[PDB]
RNA sequence: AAAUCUUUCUCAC
RNA sequence: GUGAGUAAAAUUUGG
């Protein structure tokens, strides 16, 4: 009745954060005194009785994981299993339906979890927690062939359409393209135009699935705005046109680029369930979008501005092939529509980034030296460093064209560490 | 038996050391070591490296993360009863609330702006002044840090003032940002495994790998070094105030205040200390005092040693070592090709701290072990079965369960010993969802948290402001009438929907349910 | 949305009403005037005209949707807005000058910066230390570990019996005899009896540590799991004899004797004397009604007892077994004995590690991991990492450290690396 | 008595 | 078992 004055003296108003920080009761700390606390007054026994009487019947049932693939032991690598958060509209609806406001509030935030994994699949599939060894995948077996081919980097059976090879758009596909200032979303049956005012994605029909995908890619809030209209709109022409299909897996948003600031989406395919970037996959992905503008499909450890500065510094002294590789990397790591000067030609070079003796960039846990890339190391010639002159037990002999790893070279009678080997980054030339 | 392991093993299967001894001795040893270093006899605390190349952040707007300023953890609150300073132990939330009440500031951002915009130190901010704030922020309280594996003699940790924490948050956020902008590979926010994986690739280009720890890292980081780093990145008067408080810090040992002119009191500024080294060179992959580097010739090793010395990073001759077939950082060891070293490594056992919480923690540990190459799945399944049997031996008593439902675990009177694979694949009774690592909180966890909310240092009569609109930002200001109205409106809506409390929500199960 | 303008917004509304009573302007900074389930597009919202309004300074754009009406606050005299009504409202409401504070930057120099810098300058500063000379050498050999073990042996010696470690083996008595022996041992020691429980009372303390010696290894420890479970259970139920399948213990709270009025119940800090039984044969033999058994005691504080009781012996042993080399047979003092040794003494060493609340074996394990993974180390400093007798105190920690060093030596001998 | 500055507090209801 | 005070009342013990 008057505890507000006692808790906050001399203040009439306080923030919600401070007020809620005073009544925290959902934090668990594992301590030595756990058993004594649970025993005191049969706290745990009474809690179990209450949970079995009241809480358990309200727990909903969920299905069990069934999808499995064959896995193999592989080098330890970080798997990033991004879990999207509740959308604003869905959160509002759930709250209106009498759901707990605090939990729904906590659920709006997209959460990224990185976990070590030592097993790999033939398609670089992601795995459920603790089931990488058994090969339980986050994806589910597809029904039709087009769904399976859309996600596949190299579809087995082309169908003459953009989903599974070069071609035009089917009825189950859609695209989003930036024309001038407006984002045109074409499904084939319905056409829509969107624009960002300050932080929303203004559109006539925000509920449009392509509109939701575009909002996720651009990191905006869908907002209804009938005033949005466009004049130039060659959506029918591009829909009936044929575009080359890149040999790359889907980006984290579940789309594949087909033109400058243009992406293809499948109605029944959601967020990517396979590893987008890998040692064997990074450079093909970079080459696929060298002239397609920023993508935002790769996470970089550190400041994006610093990574772009190092990329530009390497670009200054590079060759046309290395220059294209660097531009592809810059496009890969740049978020879409966040005012980033990813164009290495138009980016102002700074001299403070040229003083360091090596330019390093970390993409999805992969560390790449841009100076070495300029020297044609990751794609043309492998790097060798001698570890010892003695034969180590348990290590294989040096192959003809070695991939990354430690091998015993009998010709030099020495243990060698191969890194930046085309045999790992450019297996298929 | 850790000695006869075929692979690498740190012997983390048992818990860490613990005891009830007072922290006075450890605090005194730490302060004495810092004082000895200040004399320039044992180690070096004078920073001679060049930090003029660090980017300047003085033009960035001043922002504060409010959530980081409130917690259930402990802190020191300074009061004056009869002209004598009294240091009290209070929850950090309580300490910051008391500070805001004293300064009559709505939020910590308002308080910092007012502190930075007063014409003089003597000007009053509510019931205090910047002079009084600086005087009070230099007081610390000592405590013991137990359960640290490999440290038979427990170390001393320190509780600071809310004002000190308020400035430290800003300086540490900016130091972390500068590190992200400057370091060759950013690793401040990464885990031990990610750091090891990146370090393997970084050091693959050279022969010898130096895995390094520093000795008494906190006691050799002086206020001068912190001020130098903060001035290099443009912290303005905030850095000056923090350095002034650090130089005049006093620790309450038992009943006496002891001056500690040197040191930074056990990792008060981890990011700034790391920047002290990273701002002078880019040949180290480091955080805190744990670093890894590589070299080819003895001259490079001498250069590395000189760089470490000039950065006040005194190499620990006891622990630092050179290797050629493996690398190690943050207790994670990899082969030079980036593969996890065979053996148990840093795998830690799970003690008996509750019937279901122990099983949940064991499941999480085994999932982590099997996801990497540490353990085959069948071994993990056998270990989980064994853990269930021991939990049954320890907890299947009338003191805990008084139940006999078949689907319950054998440790709660049931006849169910769940398979590890079945639990991981959600092929189990709904009661077992909480035991899943990603499942909801366990019954033991909930009861323990509720009980912990009622301790003397945390209990309160304030009515909880729960079940809020997911759209209203938490930075908005409310009064007693505002919270009353909000609660009344929410209760009216729930009653109109024929409910008295909001429906429980679990987002993972909710997603799983969606077709 | 910026809190700087929040107060301004509150002034703009000023109890303006529409539709005969309903509030006209809704402030986006108020938790009660905000429309639930509606994203905010401006500082305030006019319900009658259904339009968002945002306040900006002359030449300072704010991140709001374009359709939002802007009320530019001119620098000198007036307030200009696209809508005339909003301009009039601004003029009438802003009778005074509610100047809004500027944006504070992190590198903001306060008036007292120079004074505080002078004060810091006048305070003590550190002096440059000496640059250390680092010499890299090979890791220590077996001889160094043997020397450390020999130093421990010479300095401290060995006990005649295994003391509480002997409790890891079953004593030749049944449940009733064990309870009888424990109760009569408590009686013979003048332990106070109250409320059906035993209490140990103390008056003065010598204030010096007890004697430290190395515990000889019993043959085996089949009762390690029961022993740890009983240690966990007893402290929460102290004062009474607690049984298991094959052994029993008695935890006696230790409280100060303060005359007629003395502490009757232990709190969260009372220490416990754990009393256990083992086969007779040492100086601790106790006899009653023809029952003979060695009675061994252990003084523990609540944290130590909780730490000891929560360890899982079986799971730890299995995890170690997963990737373990062959364990050699060792003698009673941790020496290699191929002809008369026992391989079950390793279970006893694990039990000793569990009993050691100091967990000194973890430091030895970490240093041995570093030793195995090291190609070069600092001269005379890496070896000293194996000297940990100065950081521990007590028979149990000392024996744990000695047998950890013995295990390191045994590994270096049987399976050289 | 022992793993020896530790084995520890008041008041109202 | 319910609260109030003691440089503290067991989520103790910080970054
Ligand atoms: Mg360290
Ligand atoms: Zn197709
Ligand atoms: Zn169009
Ligand atoms: Zn004896």
3-state helix, strand, coil in chain B (%, to 5): 40, 15, 45
User: Which of A32, A202, A223 is nearest residue C307 as measured by Cβ atoms?
Assistant: A32
Chain C residues with CB inside 8 Å of B208's CB? 375
Beta strands in B85-223 (DSSP E): 85-91, 124-125, 128-129, 139-145, 155-159, 208-213
What experiment produced this structure? Answer: cryo-EM
Nearest residue to nucleotide D9, by CA–C1' distance, is: C267
Are residues C183 and C288 in contact, defined by beta-carbon separation less than 8 angstroms?
A: no
- Which two three-digit tokens encode residue B23? 């922290």
Count of domains observed in chain A: 4
Are residues A336 and A413 both part of a single domain?
no
- Which two three-digit tokens encode residue B513? 């349910």
Would C371 be classed as within a structural domain? yes
Are residues B260 and B247 in contact, defined by beta-carbon separation less than 8 angstroms?
A: no
CB contact under 8 A, C30 and B476: yes
- Looking at chain B, which residue has its C-alpha nearest residue A134? B377
Ligand nearest to the CA of B212: 1
The closest of C316, C349, C327, C317 to C216, measured between CA atoms, is: C349
Are residues A418 and A351 both part of a single domain?
no
**Would the Cβ of C192 be found within 7 angstroms of any atom in strand D?**
no
- Domain ends where: C93, C114, C145? C93
- Distance between CA atoms of C89 and C68, rounded to whole angstroms? 17
Is C327 strand, coil or helix? coil
Rounded (10°) angle between helices B443-452 and B355-371: 120
- Distance between CA atoms of C295 and C286, rounded to whole angstroms? 7
As beta bridge partners, residue B118 has none
Is A297 strand, coil or helix? coil
- Distance between CA atoms of A133 and A116, rounded to whole angstroms? 12
- Looking at chain A, which residue has its C-alpha nearest residue C38? A92
Are residues C52 and C83 both part of a single domain?
yes
Q: Exposure pattern of A273-290 as b/e (b: 16+ CB <10 Å)?
A: bbbbbbbebbbbbbbbbb
Residue entry with tokens 């594949």: A256
Count Cβ atoms below 10 Å from residue A428 Cβ, excluding itself.
Answer: 7
Neighbours of chain C (3+ CB pairs under 8 A): A, B
Are residues A266 and A342 both part of a single domain?
no
- Which two three-digit tokens encode residue B353? 């701290």
Half-sphere exposure of C362 (CA within 13 A, CB side): 24
Ligand nearest to the CA of A191: 3
- Distance between CA atoms of C349 and C345, rounded to whole angstroms? 6
User: Which of A33, A95, A197 is nearest residue C66 as measured by Cβ atoms?
Assistant: A197
- Distance between CA atoms of A284 and A178, rounded to whole angstroms? 24
- Which two three-digit tokens encode residue B163? 């004002």
| DSSP category for residue A42 | G
Contacts of C398 (CB under 8 A, 6+ apart): C152, C156, C212, C213, C214, C389, C392
Q: Does C61 touch chain A (CB under 8 A)?
A: no
Are residues A264 and A299 both part of a single domain?
no
Half-sphere exposure of C154 (CA within 13 A, CB side): 6
Would C116 be classed as within a structural domain? no
Are residues A262 and A301 both part of a single domain?
no
Are residues B282 and A356 in contact, defined by beta-carbon separation less than 8 angstroms?
A: yes
Are residues C186 and C276 both part of a single domain?
yes
Are residues C182 and C288 both part of a single domain?
yes
Are residues C58 and C170 both part of a single domain?
no
Enclosing domain of residue A268: 173-272
N- to C-terminal Cα separation, chain B? 50
Are residues C150 and C172 both part of a single domain?
no
Would A164 be classed as within a structural domain? no
The closest of A123, C16, C359, A89 to B348, measured between CA atoms, is: C359
Are residues A336 and A408 both part of a single domain?
no
Would A92 be classed as within a structural domain? no
Are residues A279 and A376 both part of a single domain?
yes
**Nucleotide with C1' nearest the B78 CA:** E7
Rounded (10°) angle between helices B162-182 and B270-278: 30
Are residues C146 and C270 both part of a single domain?
no
CB contact under 8 A, C312 and B146: no
Q: Which site among B337, B398, B435, B495 would you substitute to test the A interface, given the most A Cβ atoms closer than 10 Å to its Cβ?
A: B337
Q: Does A271 touch chain B (CB under 8 A)?
A: no
As beta bridge partners, residue B144 has B156
Would A71 be classed as within a structural domain? no
Enclosing domain of residue C244: 163-309
Are residues C44 and C62 both part of a single domain?
yes
Least Cα separation, residue B280 to chain C (angstroms): 18
Are residues A227 and A207 both part of a single domain?
yes
Are residues C242 and C269 both part of a single domain?
yes
Q: Does A33 touch chain B (CB under 8 A)?
A: no
Is A41 strand, coil or helix? helix
Are residues A376 and A387 both part of a single domain?
no
- Domain ends where: A272, A297, A331? A272
Resolution (A): 2.7
The C1' atom of E14 and the CA atom of A260 lie apart, in whole Å, by: 52
Count Cβ atoms below 10 Å from residue C261 Cβ, excluding itself.
Answer: 6
Protein-contacted bases of chain E (C-beta within 7 A): 1, 3-4, 6-15
Would C204 be classed as within a structural domain? yes
* Alpha carbon of residue C198 to chain centroid: 31
C-alpha to C-alpha distances, B429 to B413, B417, B438, C281, nearest whole angstrom: 15, 12, 15, 54
CB contact under 8 A, A91 and B93: no
Could you tell me how many residues make up chain C?
417
Would A146 be classed as within a structural domain? no
Centroid of ligand 1 to alpha carbon of B316 (angstroms):
9
- Distance between CA atoms of C353 and C25, rounded to whole angstroms? 71
**Nucleotide with C1' nearest the B165 CA:** E15
- Domain ends where: C292, C309, C326? C309
Which residue ranges of A are tagged as binding site for Zn(2+)?
A: 146, 159, 163-164, 184, 191, 233, 235
Q: What angle do CA B328, B334, B338 make, to 5 degrees?
A: 130
- Domain ends where: A254, A272, A290? A272
Least Cα separation, residue B15 to chain A (angstroms): 10
N- to C-terminal Cα separation, chain C? 65
Are residues C301 and C352 both part of a single domain?
no
Chain C residues with CB inside 8 Å of B368's CB? none
Would C130 be classed as within a structural domain? no
As beta bridge partners, residue B124 has B129
Chain A residues with CB inside 8 Å of C309's CB? 35
Is C376 strand, coil or helix? strand
Half-sphere exposure of A408 (CA within 13 A, CB side): 11
Are residues B226 and B272 in contact, defined by beta-carbon separation less than 8 angstroms?
A: yes
The closest of B111, B485, B507, B483 to A23, measured between CA atoms, is: B483
Are residues A200 and A182 both part of a single domain?
yes
Q: Exposure pattern of A52-86 as b/e (b: 16+ CB <10 Å)?
A: beeeeeebeebeebeeeeebeeebbbbbbbeeeeb
Q: Does B190 touch chain C (CB under 8 A)?
A: no
C-alpha to C-alpha distances, A312 to A329, A346, C262, nearest whole angstrom: 11, 10, 79
Would C100 be classed as within a structural domain? no
Are residues B6 and C323 in contact, defined by beta-carbon separation less than 8 angstroms?
A: yes
- Domain ends where: A204, A237, A272? A272
- Domain ends where: C285, C309, C333? C309
Are residues A312 and A233 both part of a single domain?
no
* Alpha carbon of residue A195 to chain centroid: 24
Which residue ranges of B are tagged as binding site?
A: 212-214, 289-290, 328
- Which two three-digit tokens encode residue C285? 């033999």
Is B172 strand, coil or helix? helix
Are residues C233 and C153 both part of a single domain?
no
Are residues A346 and A252 both part of a single domain?
no
Chain B residues with CB inside 8 Å of A98's CB? 493-494, 497, 499, 502-503
- Distance between CA atoms of A327 and B172, rounded to whole angstroms? 34
- Distance between CA atoms of B90 and B456, rounded to whole angstroms? 10
Count of domains observed in chain C: 3
Would C106 be classed as within a structural domain? no
Chain C residues with CB inside 8 Å of B324's CB? 375
Would C142 be classed as within a structural domain? yes
- Which two three-digit tokens encode residue C93? 């409401």
- Distance between CA atoms of B418 and C257, rounded to whole angstroms? 51
Count Cβ atoms below 10 Å from residue C16 Cβ, excluding itself.
Answer: 13
SS3 sequence, C57-108?
ECCECCCCCCCCEEEEECCCCCEEECCHHHHHHHHHHCCCCCCCCCCCECCC
Centroid of ligand 1 to alpha carbon of C133 (angstroms):
21
- Paired sense of beta strands A221-224 and A200-203, if any: parallel
Alpha helix positions (H), C102-203: 113-122, 142-156, 175-188
């Amino acid at each position: 009745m008057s505890q507000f004055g006692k808790s906050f003296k001399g203040r009439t108003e306080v923030t919600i954060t401070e007020y809620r920080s005073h009544t925290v009761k959902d934090v668990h700390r594992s301590l030595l005194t756990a058993d004594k606390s649970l025993r005191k007054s049969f706290c745990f026994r009474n809690a179990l009785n209450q949970f079995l009487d009241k809480d358990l019947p309200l727990l909903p049932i969920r299905p069990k994981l069934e999808s499995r693939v064959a896995v193999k032991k592989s080098k330890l690598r970080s798997q990033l299993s991004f879990r999207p958060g509740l959308t604003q509209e869905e959160a509002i609806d759930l709250y209106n339906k009498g759901y707990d406001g605090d939990s729904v509030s906590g659920a709006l935030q997209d959460r990224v979890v990185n976990e070590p994994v030592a097993y790999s699949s033939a398609d670089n599939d992601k795995f459920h927690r603790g089931l990488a060894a058994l090969g339980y995948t986050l994806a589910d077996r597809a029904f039709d062939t087009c769904e399976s081919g859309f996600v596949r980097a190299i579809p087995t059976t082309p169908c003459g359409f953009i989903c599974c090879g070069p071609g035009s758009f089917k009825d189950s596909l859609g695209f989003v393209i930036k024309i001038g200032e407006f984002w045109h979303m074409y499904d084939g049956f319905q056409h829509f135009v969107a624009v960002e005012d300050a932080k929303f994605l203004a559109s006539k029909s925000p509920s449009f699935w392509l509109a939701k995908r575009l909002a996720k890619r651009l990191n905006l809030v869908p907002k209804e705005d009938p005033s949005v209209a466009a004049a130039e709109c060659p959506c029918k022409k591009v829909w009936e046109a044929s575009f080359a299909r890149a040999p790359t897996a889907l980006d984290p948003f579940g789309g594949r680029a087909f033109c400058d600031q243009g992406w293809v989406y499948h109605r029944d395919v959601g967020y990517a369930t396979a590893n987008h970037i890998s040692q064997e996959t990074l450079f093909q992905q970079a080459l696929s979008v060298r002239n397609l503008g920023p993508q935002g499909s790769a996470n970089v450890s550190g400041s994006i501005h610093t990574a772009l500065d190092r990329l530009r510094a390497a670009y200054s002294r590079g060759t046309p092939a290395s220059r294209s590789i660097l531009q592809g990397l810059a496009n890969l790591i740049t978020p879409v529509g966040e005012n980033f000067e990813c164009d290495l030609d138009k980016r102002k070079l700074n001299i403070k980034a040229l003083r360091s003796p090596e330019r390093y960039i970390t993409i999805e846990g992969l560390v790449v030296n841009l100076d070495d890339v300029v020297r044609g190391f990751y794609l043309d010639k492998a790097k060798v460093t001698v570890l010892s002159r003695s034969k180590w037990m348990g290590y294989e002999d040096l192959p003809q064209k070695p991939p990354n790893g430690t091998f015993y070279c009998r010709k030099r009678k020495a243990m060698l560490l191969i890194s930046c080997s085309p045999g790992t980054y450019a297996k298929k030339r | 038996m850790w000695a006869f392991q075929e692979g690498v093993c740190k012997g983390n299967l048992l818990s860490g050391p613990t005891s009830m001894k007072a922290p006075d001795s450890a605090a005194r040893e730490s302060i004495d070591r810092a004082s000895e270093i200040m004399t320039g006899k044992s180690y070096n605390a004078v920073h001679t490296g060049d930090l003029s190349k660090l980017p300047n952040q003085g033009e960035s707007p001043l922002r504060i993360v409010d959530s980081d300023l409130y917690s259930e953890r402990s802190c020191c609150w300074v009061i004056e009863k009869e002209g004598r300073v009294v240091c009290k132990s209070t929850t950090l939330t309580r300490g910051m609330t008391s500070l805001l009440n004293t300064t009559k500031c709505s939020s910590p951002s308002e308080l910092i702006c007012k502190v930075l915009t007063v014409e003089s130190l003597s000007e009053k901010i509510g019931d205090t002044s910047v002079e009084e704030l600086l005087s009070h922020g230099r007081y610390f309280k000592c405590a013991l840090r137990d359960q640290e594996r490999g440290k038979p003699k427990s170390r001393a940790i320190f509780l600071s003032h809310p004002f000190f924490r308020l400035l430290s948050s800003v300086v540490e956020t900016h130091a972390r940002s500068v590190l992200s902008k400057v370091s060759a590979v950013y690793t401040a926010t990464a885990s031990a495994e990610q750091r090891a994986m990146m370090a393997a690739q970084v050091v693959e280009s050279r022969k010898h790998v130096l895995n390094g720890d520093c000795t008494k890292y906190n006691e050799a980081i002086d206020a001068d070094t912190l001020l130098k780093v903060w001035d290099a990145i443009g912290m303005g008067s905030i850095g000056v105030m923090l350095a002034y408080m650090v130089r005049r810090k006093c620790v309450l040992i038992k009943d006496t205040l002891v001056e500690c002119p040197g040191g930074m009191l056990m990792g008060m500024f981890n990011a700034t200390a790391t920047l002290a080294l990273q701002g002078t060179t880019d040949r180290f992959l480091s955080f805190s005092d744990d670093f890894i580097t590589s070299f080819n010739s003895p001259a490079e090793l001498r250069e590395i040693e000189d760089l470490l010395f000039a950065s006040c990073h005194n190499l620990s001759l006891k622990k630092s070592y050179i290797s050629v077939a493996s690398l190690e950082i943050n207790s994670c060891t990899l082969t030079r090709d980036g593969d996890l070293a065979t053996g148990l490594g840093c795998t830690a056992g799970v003690p008996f701290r509750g019937p279901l919480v122990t099983l949940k923690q064991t499941a999480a540990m085994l999932s982590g072990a099997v996801d990497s190459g540490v353990m085959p799945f069948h071994s993990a399944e056998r270990l989980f079965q064994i853990k269930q049997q021991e939990c049954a031996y320890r907890y299947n008593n009338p003191t805990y369960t008084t139940r006999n439902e078949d689907f319950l675990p054998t440790c709660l009177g049931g006849k169910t010993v769940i398979s590890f694979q079945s639990l991981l694949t959600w092929d189990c009774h709904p009661f077992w969802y909480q035991v899943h690592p990603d499942g909801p909180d366990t019954i033991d966890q909930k009861v323990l948290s509720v009980l912990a909310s009622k301790t003397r240092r945390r209990r309160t009569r304030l009515e909880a402001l729960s079940d809020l609109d997911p759209l209203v930002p938490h930075r908005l200001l409310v009064s007693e009438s505002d919270v009353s109205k909000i609660r009344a409106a929410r209760q009216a809506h729930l009653k109109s929907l024929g409910l008295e409390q909001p429906t429980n929500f679990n987002y993972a199960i909710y997603k799983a349910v969606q077709p | 949305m910026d809190s700087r303008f929040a107060q301004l917004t509150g002034v703009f509304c000023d109890d303006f009403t529409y539709s005969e009573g309903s509030r006209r302007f809704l402030s986006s900074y108020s938790t009660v005037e905000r429309r639930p389930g509606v994203p905010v597009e401006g500082d305030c919202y006019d319900c009658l005209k259904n339009k968002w309004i945002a306040f900006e300074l002359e030449g300072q754009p704010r991140k709001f949707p374009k359709a939002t009406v802007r009320c530019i606050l001119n620098n000198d005299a007036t307030y200009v807005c696209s809508e005339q009504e909003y301009q009039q409202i601004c003029k009438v409401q802003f009778k005074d000058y509610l100047e809004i504070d500027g944006v504070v930057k992190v590198g903001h120099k306060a008036s007292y910066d120079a004074e505080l810098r002078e004060r810091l300058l006048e305070l003590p500063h550190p002096k440059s230390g000496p640059k250390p000379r680092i010499e890299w050498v090979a890791p220590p050999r077996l001889a160094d570990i043997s020397k450390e073990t020999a130093e421990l042996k010479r300095q401290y010696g060995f006990f005649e019996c295994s003391k509480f470690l002997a409790c890891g083996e079953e004593c030749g008595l049944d449940q009733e005899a064990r309870e009888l022996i424990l109760n009569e041992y408590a009686r013979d020691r003048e332990f106070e009896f109250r409320n059906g429980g035993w209490i140990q009372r103390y008056t003065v303390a010598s204030h010096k540590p007890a004697t430290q010696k190395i515990l000889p290894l019993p043959a085996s420890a089949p009762l390690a799991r029961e022993l740890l479970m009983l240690i966990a259970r007893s402290t929460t139920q102290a004062g009474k004899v607690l049984h298991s399948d094959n052994t029993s213990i008695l935890a006696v709270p230790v409280m100060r004797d303060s005359g007629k009025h003395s502490k009757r119940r232990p709190t969260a800090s009372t220490h416990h004397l754990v009393v256990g039984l083992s086969k007779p044969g040492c100086e601790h033999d106790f006899e009653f009604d023809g029952y003979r058994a060695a009675v061994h005691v252990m003084h523990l504080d609540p944290k130590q007892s909780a730490n000891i009781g929560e360890q899982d012996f079986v799971s730890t042993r299995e995890i170690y077994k997963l990737d373990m080399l062959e364990l050699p047979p060792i003698s009673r003092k941790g020496d290699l004995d191929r002809a008369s040794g026992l391989e079950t003494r390793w279970d006893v060493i694990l039990l000793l590690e569990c009993l050691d609340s100091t967990r000194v074996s973890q430091a030895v394990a970490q240093h041995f991991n570093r030793h195995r993974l090291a190609l070069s180390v600092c001269k005379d400093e890496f070896r000293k990492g194996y000297q940990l007798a100065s950081e521990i105190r007590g028979t149990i920690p000392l024996s744990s450290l000695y047998y950890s060093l013995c295990a390191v030596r045994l590994r270096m001998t049987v399976h050289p690396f």
